[PDB]
């Protein structure tokens, strides 16, 4: 249907949640990647989580 802003039920968050990532975060990666797929979100989180502007518990690599 031509529904709008219809995304209350847990769909893409399921995987982004079971992995450990919260909601506010999992949502950012989703909207960023374009709600294409759970994996996509991970690719955006692994590249974002590693930044001084994005304070999160997601501990990165030694250097990063």
From Swiss-Prot:
Role, per record: Interferes with CBL-mediated down-regulation and degradation of receptor-type tyrosine kinases. Promotes accumulation of activated target receptors, such as T-cell receptors, EGFR and PDGFRB, on the cell surface. Exhibits negligible protein tyrosine phosphatase activity at neutral pH. May act as a dominant-negative regulator of UBASH3B-dependent dephosphorylation. May inhibit dynamin-dependent endocytic pathways by functionally sequestering dynamin via its SH3 domain.
Tissue expression per record: Highest expression of UBASH3A in tissues belonging to the immune system, including spleen, peripheral blood leukocytes, thymus and bone marrow.
Name recorded for this polypeptide: Ubiquitin-associated and SH3 domain-containing protein A
Residues of the full protein shown: 20 to 70 of 661
Domain of life: Eukaryota
Gene encoding the protein: UBASH3A
Compartments reported by the entry: Cytoplasm; Nucleus
Domain UBA: 8-48
Record's subunit section: Homodimer or homooligomer. Interacts with CBL. Part of a complex containing CBL and activated EGFR. Interacts with ubiquitin and with mono-ubiquitinated proteins. Interacts with dynamin.
């Amino acid at each position: 249907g031509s529904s709008g802003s219809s995304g209350s039920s847990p769909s893409l968050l399921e995987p982004l949640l079971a992995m450990g990532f919260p909601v506010h975060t999992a949502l950012k990666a989703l909207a960023a990647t374009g709600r294409k797929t759970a994996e996509e979100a991970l690719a955006w989180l692994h590249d974002h989580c590693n930044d001084p502007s994005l304070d999160d518990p997601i501990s990165g690599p030694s250097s990063g």
